[PDB]
Amino acid sequence: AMDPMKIADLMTLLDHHVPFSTAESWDNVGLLIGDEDVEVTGVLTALDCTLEVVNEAIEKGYNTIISHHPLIFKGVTSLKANGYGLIIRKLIQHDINLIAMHTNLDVNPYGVNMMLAKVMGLKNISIINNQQDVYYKVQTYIPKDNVGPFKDKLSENGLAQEGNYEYCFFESEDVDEVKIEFMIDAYQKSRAEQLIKQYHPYETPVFDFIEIKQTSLYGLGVMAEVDNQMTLEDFAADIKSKLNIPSVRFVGESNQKIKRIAIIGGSGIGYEYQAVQQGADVFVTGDIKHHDALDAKIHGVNLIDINHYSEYVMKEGLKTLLMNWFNIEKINIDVEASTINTDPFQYI
Amino acid sequence: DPMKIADLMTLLDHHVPFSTAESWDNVGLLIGDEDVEVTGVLTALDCTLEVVNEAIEKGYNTIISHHPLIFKGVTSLKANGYGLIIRKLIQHDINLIAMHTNLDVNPYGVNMMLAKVMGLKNISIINNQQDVYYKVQEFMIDAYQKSRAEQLIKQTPVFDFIEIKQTSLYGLGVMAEVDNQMTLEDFAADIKSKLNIPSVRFVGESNQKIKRIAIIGGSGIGYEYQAVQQGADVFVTGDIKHHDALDAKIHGVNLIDINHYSEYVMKEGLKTLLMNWFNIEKINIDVEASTINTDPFQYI
Amino acid sequence: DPMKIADLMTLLDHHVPFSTAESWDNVGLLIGDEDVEVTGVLTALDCTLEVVNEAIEKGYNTIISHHPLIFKGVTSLKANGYGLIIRKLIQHDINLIAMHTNLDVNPYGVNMMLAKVMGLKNISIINNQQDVYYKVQEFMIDAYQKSRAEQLIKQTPVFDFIEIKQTSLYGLGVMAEVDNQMTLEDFAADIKSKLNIPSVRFVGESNQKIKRIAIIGGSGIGYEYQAVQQGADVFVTGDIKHHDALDAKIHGVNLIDINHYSEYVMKEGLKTLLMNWFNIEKINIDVEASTINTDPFQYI
Amino acid sequence: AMDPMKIADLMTLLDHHVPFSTAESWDNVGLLIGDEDVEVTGVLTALDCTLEVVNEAIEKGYNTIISHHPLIFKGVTSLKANGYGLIIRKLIQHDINLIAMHTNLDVNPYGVNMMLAKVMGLKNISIINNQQDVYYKVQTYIPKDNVGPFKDKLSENGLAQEGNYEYCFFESEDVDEVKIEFMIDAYQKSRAEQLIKQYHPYETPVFDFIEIKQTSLYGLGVMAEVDNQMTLEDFAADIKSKLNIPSVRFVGESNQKIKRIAIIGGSGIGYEYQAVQQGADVFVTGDIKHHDALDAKIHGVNLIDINHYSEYVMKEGLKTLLMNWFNIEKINIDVEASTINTDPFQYI
Amino acid sequence: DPMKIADLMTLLDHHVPFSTAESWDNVGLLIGDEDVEVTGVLTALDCTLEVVNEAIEKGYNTIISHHPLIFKGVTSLKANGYGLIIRKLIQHDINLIAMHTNLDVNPYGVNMMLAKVMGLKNISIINNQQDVYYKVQEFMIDAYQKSRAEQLIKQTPVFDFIEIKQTSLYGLGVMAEVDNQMTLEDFAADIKSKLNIPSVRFVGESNQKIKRIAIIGGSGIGYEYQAVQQGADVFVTGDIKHHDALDAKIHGVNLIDINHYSEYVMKEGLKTLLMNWFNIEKINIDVEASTINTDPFQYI
Amino acid sequence: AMDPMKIADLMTLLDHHVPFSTAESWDNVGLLIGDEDVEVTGVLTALDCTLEVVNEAIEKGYNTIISHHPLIFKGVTSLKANGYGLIIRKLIQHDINLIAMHTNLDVNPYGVNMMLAKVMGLKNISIINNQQDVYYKVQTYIPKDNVGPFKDKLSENGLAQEGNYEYCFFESEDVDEVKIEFMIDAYQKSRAEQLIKQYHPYETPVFDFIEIKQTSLYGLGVMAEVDNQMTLEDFAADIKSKLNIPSVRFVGESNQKIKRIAIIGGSGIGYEYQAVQQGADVFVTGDIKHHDALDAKIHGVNLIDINHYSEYVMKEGLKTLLMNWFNIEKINIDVEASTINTDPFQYI
Ligand SMILES: [Zn+2]
Ligand SMILES: [Zn+2]
Ligand SMILES: [Zn+2]
Ligand SMILES: [Zn+2]
Ligand SMILES: [Zn+2]
Ligand SMILES: [Zn+2]
Ligand SMILES: [Zn+2]
Ligand SMILES: [Zn+2]
Ligand SMILES: [Zn+2]
Ligand SMILES: [Zn+2]
Ligand SMILES: [Zn+2]
Ligand SMILES: [Zn+2]
């Protein structure tokens, strides 16, 4: 008897590759509308889950929509047949599940900004603005001989990855001891306390947790470079064509030479000065407003507004990711990128 | 011409104006479609999953609850917790309307209803709101009338809108009285019995004499000192906590905790009001009070 | 008797009262010396270094900008960034005056100017401020008059100041209309051409029909729902972002982003007003609109 | 010539066993009304120091009242012959001292929640919601031979507990050194700096303080278990009887099987979800309100409201503690638990 | 029928209404028993332990201080610091009343008292409060009268309460004048001598000419710009700090720091007022000004 | 062709000796008005940069003013010919540069409070209220033999001061390793990550950054002592004379014996209780107000108000410092302390 993938199985897989915990604390991510117990019949990727997207999923026989933008962001106070209420109600009425992979996908090594840089044909793409993850270096003190492996083996048996580090030294030079050390993630602190107490000895078994911060693989934005050095206006025209953008605008001398590019898709104004500090010749983002562009201009910070809507690259990008992850796990569920242009703006 | 949700909403607003609700509150049509024809109305304190099941059972597509099922914004709608109730409503095409603080402050609302169930006399609204009305220079106008009256009166004329403040009919709480003075203990026992309450608790000497009573159903602590100022011998409310009771006791302010759940009286009270309003308008729609006891507490 | 900065400031305040500006805003003489004789006036949207160079070139010692060059307090004044422009003004004895939100809400200001440049009809101020005026008991008085009228009327008399609130002439935005209904797409194209805009974008079906138009130049998102309430078929503003456009789209609210930079129309609009005001007062001072395109954006 | 116990001596003893520093930072604990210099004539324990409690102390010839709840919580703005003013004035006029042992007693291993669990007849009682205490691992580098004990001995002489830990290694492999390490509490950092500077050598004597956090023995609440698995309603009836409560109310299916119990006496709503995470079958507390019970019910979190007033168990509990502490120290001062029922509520 | 604390409180409220005190302030009976018969009244700026000892010595059981001994809530009452003074009061059955900001804004209060001690002329309250009074439709009513007048006038009648705002008699500060113009230096020296101040300091050229003087006793910085607006040549207050003095100096605003402690003049000033009020009411109770110099500063 | 000192060269030198980063985060320090590219013609020191000070610099041919107090503190919203606008405009019009050395000079070992204590003739002067600086102890694990110096040499080549510390031990007792450790300042964390990755080996090169906090040399205030124990009033009269103060006021018994003195020039009320904890017999500051003096008196905290204006000692103090720093660097630029008494107060 089969184990067809349920929403709960999909959630675990999504979380493995694009951890929901990497989303900002203000964000609203994960299963927003649906039922964990339901069997997935197909997956439609979307930037914004508009009414037409829901209609498209229904028409295709798919019961799961993964969007970038959370359809429910601040709590909804009503669910009427109007506005966003009409979309939410239609999902529920048709038993469609909606998952949001929002800022977790913005900060992922394979997420929105890797996807943007790739579509722009750029090279040497690296995450920037790295998160910091908290670890602990756990240090225990134990006598030599057989009580060392006795510790090692039991500790490694009950989890806590089998990489240890051992040094001789004297407690008091009365009691000669071995100081053992290993790493734990911040969540394991509790378990590590338990397991050390259970399989150690004395009246006062000595153990320490030393906070270690490590640079994360996750961060908001990428730095990349063009193949060949280019003028600002030529780089702007190039990416307008590659991303099929109706209108692009840039801030800076049109003949400015550009090699290193920082990209935060969406609305990344607030990071442009830091991007310049980090080595960018231009900061690429959307939703750039007059006074921030004016400020950038006077300071010599070069900008390109590719429009917030250029995050739409994640529909095909995430479709490709998910098909790969499904291949690995030998899952045959169909994934399609929504073909609807959901940009609220029409350009003239 | 069959009554739709939109028509119900108009009628309810007429009799219990949604604008009298507190600004923090979430009232009106919370879940539904205003174009849908009302098949029947079930009244509820809390819209639990059992209450939704009851509406479905009775063939009713409209629930009016006191407490808003969605109060702070919902962050997700999953098949769990409150998500389950909201999803069940939507999937069964049930409309949910909340008449919350607008009902608490209505002259015929929660506190009138409590005082009637207690058999009280001389019941009047306390803690009255203030209505803003302009005298135009002379005749009277309401809040919104101030825009159009310029838009009308400017067809070179010299005119004036004078703000006048009027004590509202609407307010949180009622003051009322027993026929004859009774002890605090006897009054607490009397209302326990009348409201079918499993357990009541009071603050004050059992032999204190009670004539004038202030009532705020739900959770009305914060108002007990004012009530005493307004003439109450006792303040009746729910959800009274230790430190607030201890303060009242030391200050000589008498209280009775009838439990927040005592707002359940609005189910029958609202059923009766709505049957009457329907009668006036010649609407032939069935209204029932939910029979489900939705108190999360069981008393021993 | 030659006009000084102080005299200019008086005249500008007469026609576009600096007190109609928002309380957060920074308006008036921002950089200068009120005793200095005005040699000429250059109007500007943003006072860039190029605009300062232009004033110097033209022999003008007075610039009137819409946008305040100093908005939040300056923490330093170095030869870099905005420091460069402020220092250049001072070192060349150029006076900078900001007519910012007071011009946005003026009956002849930014939004009248936008609606005229679009060739619109029936243009009226929307979002009107409220003026406080007292009726004394009877005759009328203004804001400041309430002090002196006691100081005058107390020379034992029994008197009254009655607060009356009056719809102001001043407000953020105008409502206006085209001669004949046109599609949303055609109207957007029409205004693109009339304002010489490199790129315009709109929200709403291209074949939506437009008759009544609400305009707030600059960055007016926050007001689009109210505008629709006030009768607009479309809200015209700049600096529209994705999520605000997506919200409007789902709610059926039509928008056009003409870009914040479209406030540049106030350069010629202000030049014309100031030439007229000068004429009335028989002041022979040259006024020019800056010809510099100061948009930080270049469009492709 | 005697050393009769003064309030200041009592305060030191109280603080030793139920440290005032473990109280919450918003709390108001310790000597609230009185004179440190005054000789203690007897001690009356109380939940709330009401007028009748003060009258009881006067009648008994006791000049010290220890209450759980602070009679002065937010600053008093007046002291009139009315309300709480009348109680405060009566204490002062009769030279009665009032000490509050509030949230420090809530979080103590022998405090309010241990006492509740014991009165309920429960077993395997353990503190939960543990505080974290900050320590430092101080590391200094010193040459071997005689300068090691020279360091050890002087450091241990000037306090800083004589548990050291020593390891060989090379500074620069030019200057061979011994790295010595030991623990200090967070307050000793200053002294440790001084003492290391004074008895070390070089131009730049190398020493480090490494922050270590340890799970405290103090925490808000206990987890315990019933002897024999029981239904929720039976457990509720049992504890109503054991604590002599006029009325108890519970949230949950009456036949729910209960083994593990979390208890926060007083008003502990806000912790029930965490208690369930920590393994509780039911969260026992007081002052439970409708909407929080409604939420608990829908989420399957089981609750029992034993009333805030059930904290009254600390009068006899603290009396027993204090008599034990006085025995140890050979102090003959009488301690009595106030017999007044001070519950503002009367149940019908 | 001997005067109790409650009767004193009524009389003081009549002449120096406790409701004119700032909302942050702590005034009235701070420590005491309103049923206790007043044996005598000692006036005080600060109620120090020495002032309590003086009351006890004189056989007086009532102290009226300007500064509230309890301002923010007391968190403990131990035999140390301020605890010592509060405990001594209570243990000796001394009643402490605070007439703080209500005395600062009174027409006969701190600032009248300062201006009199300086020998000034044409003294008037500045910074006046606003009194709310309703004209009922016509006759006048006060703040509280608005409730009962409905409760009275509703025995179907159509009526109106019109809010009228009236300049109060009460305000922080006085404006006053010398008989003849004098230099800033000479005026500072004159008031130093008249108030027996060990050290005075002034801001402004020593030869500036002074005629009109604004005074706020205590710590009145924040009001100096307004005072100049109101016509003052100099603002007189205490507790002036470097940066506030430097700002005033650069703006041409003249100041004199007479020290916060100069509010001590209210001891004799209040003694005189209270003897007079007692006379009117035929109360034979002794009132003395405390003779203790309570300044924490000693000057060298 | 010369390298005459420009403002940018002066800024670097100032920052070296009195780091701008030690200023409070609310403060406004450094070059407030001027041009980094301009050649310095002479330096005038000032407490407050008043109009007369600017006039004095012009008259002397000096184009640089260093003040203690920042002429621009909260952003200026206008620059009119009035008030502070007139001073700012006059600086700009005459090409005068103004640097503020504000709270950085308050907390410097040679700054305002050292200068105050020295002018008072005091001894044993020590900074108090020390800042804490964040460092990292970087720990890497590397095999013995030749890969150790290979690491050492390259790491030391690319900066990161050549003080290392080495200990033997076993990774897994499979792979025997050397644990190397060294210090970095908090800014080097990024570089250290790079350089370790570049010149280390494995699939997972193990390195840790351990946060170390050290007591700074910078702090607000000094503690010092009088030569000979003195009465409070005599100490007050002495310092009034030494600093030429028109009027001094003190709080405390006039015959109180004084040996240890805490000094925060300016407006240091808020620190007096801590100063007493730290061992002061009197707290010396300016701008003392009635209610704070009243509080101090009742608590037995002794105060002397020497007036905020007594910070004027830094004009000659900083002149002396700067002349010394210029000597070292062989710079011939004139430095003069402004002679203008800029006290807004005149005493009578
Ligand atoms: Zn994104
Ligand atoms: Zn986005
Ligand atoms: Zn209610
Ligand atoms: Zn309720
Ligand atoms: Zn504008
Ligand atoms: Zn603008
Ligand atoms: Zn407790
Ligand atoms: Zn409690
Ligand atoms: Zn005062
Ligand atoms: Zn005062
Ligand atoms: Zn300073
Ligand atoms: Zn200073």
Residue numbers in the entry:
A (entry chain B), D (entry chain B), F (entry chain B): -3 to 168, 191 to 366
B (entry chain A), C (entry chain A), E (entry chain A): -1 to 135, 199 to 216, 222 to 366
Reproduce, without paraphrasing, sentences from the article in which this PDB structure was first reported:
The two NIF3 domains at the N- and C-terminus of the protein (henceforth denoted as NIF3-N and NIF3-C, respectively) have the same overall fold as canonical NIF3-like proteins, with a central 5 stranded mixed β-sheet and a pair of helices on either side. The middle region of the polypeptide (residues 126–236) bulges out between the two NIF3 domains and is structured as a classical PII-like fold with a (β/α/β)2 architecture, confirming our earlier prediction.
The final model of SA1388 (gi:54040095 Swissprot: P67273;) refined to 2.0Å resolution consists of two subunits in the asymmetric unit. One subunit is traceable across the entire length of polypeptide from the N- to the C-terminus (residues 1 to 366) with the exception of a loop region containing 25 residues (168–193) in the central PII domain. In the other monomer, several more residues are disordered (139 – 193). The two SA1388 monomers in the asymmetric unit tightly associate to form a dimer along the sides of the two NIF3 domains opposite to where the PII-domain is located. Further analysis of symmetry mates within the rhombohedral unit cell showed that the individual subunits are organized into hexamers with a cage-like appearance. In SA1388, the two entries to the central hollow space are capped by the two PII domain trimers. We observe clear electron density for two tightly bound metal ions at the junction of the two NIF3 domains in each SA1388 monomer close to the protein surface that face inside the hexameric toroid. The identity of the metal was determined to be zinc, first by an extended X-ray fluorescence scan at synchrotron and was further confirmed by Inductively Coupled Plasma (ICP) atomic emission spectrometry. Additionally, we observe a clear electron density for a ligand of unknown identity in close proximity to the two bound zinc atoms that would provide two additional metal ligands, one to each of the two metal ions to complete the octahedral metal center configuration.
